[PDB]
Structure 1
Amino acid sequence: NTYQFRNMIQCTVPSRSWWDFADYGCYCGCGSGTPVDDLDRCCQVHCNCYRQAGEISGCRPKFKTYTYECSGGTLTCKGDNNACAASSCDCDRLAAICFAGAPYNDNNYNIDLKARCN
């Protein structure tokens, strides 16, 4: 669920408030257009990831509570997860890991979506 994903982020990127990713580029906050950079593409893969999970009957990616462990840059989705929860967890985890490897460009935060992603 959203809350768990927020933790993975604080996990892999402690030097930043999860808000730094609530409105970055064209995809962090999930939309469309040309990714602005590596970090934005991370979010691009994440939204698409959520979209595939939605194809599993009864699977609400923003809400599905899953089992995971986030230990100092280390993220682990637990096996005790069903198809929906397992898929969701791998989305968030991989996105969290992705953020950790992509530069964060202050320019790309809170950009004009109407003009830049359309």
Structure 2
Amino acid sequence: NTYQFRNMIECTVPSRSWWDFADYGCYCGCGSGTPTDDLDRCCQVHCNCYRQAGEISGCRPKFKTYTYQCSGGTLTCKGNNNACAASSCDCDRLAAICFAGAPYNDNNYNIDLKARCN
């Protein structure tokens, strides 16, 4: 669920408030257009990841509670997870790890989506 994903982020990127990713580029907040950079593409793969999970009957990625452990840059989705929960958890985790390896460009935060992603 959203809350768990927020933790993975604080996990892999402690030097930043999860808000730093609530409105970055064209995808961190989820949308469309040309990803403005590596970090934005991270979010691009994450939205698409959520979209595939939605194809599993009854699966609401945004709300599905899953089992994971986030231990200092280390993220682990637990096996006790079902298809929906397992898929959701791997989306968030991979996105959290992805953020950790992509530079964060202050320019790309809160950009004009109408003009830049359309």
The TM-score, its normalising length taken from structure 1, stands at 1.00
Partner Cα distance (2:89, 2:30) in 1:
17
Partner Cα distance (1:66, 1:89) in 2:
6
Q: Which 4+ residue blocks in structure 1 deviate beyond 3 angstroms?
A: none
1:50-101, Cα deviation, whole Å (9 max, x unpaired):
0000000000000000000000000000000000000000000000000000
Shift of 1:20: 0.0
1:6-37, Cα deviation, whole Å (9 max, x unpaired):
00000000000000000000000000000000
Shift of 1:108: 0.0
Shift of 1:48: 0.0
Partner Cα distance (2:48, 2:73) in 1:
24
Partner Cα distance (2:96, 2:114) in 1:
26
Partner Cα distance (2:89, 2:65) in 1:
9
Secondary structure of 1:79 counterpart: coil
Shift of 1:116: 0.0
Structural RMSD (CA): 0.1
Q: Unpaired segments of 5 or more residues in structure 2?
A: none
Partner Cα distance (1:16, 1:9) in 2:
9
Map of 1:92 onto structure 2: 92
Count, aligned residues: 118
Shift of 1:45: 0.0
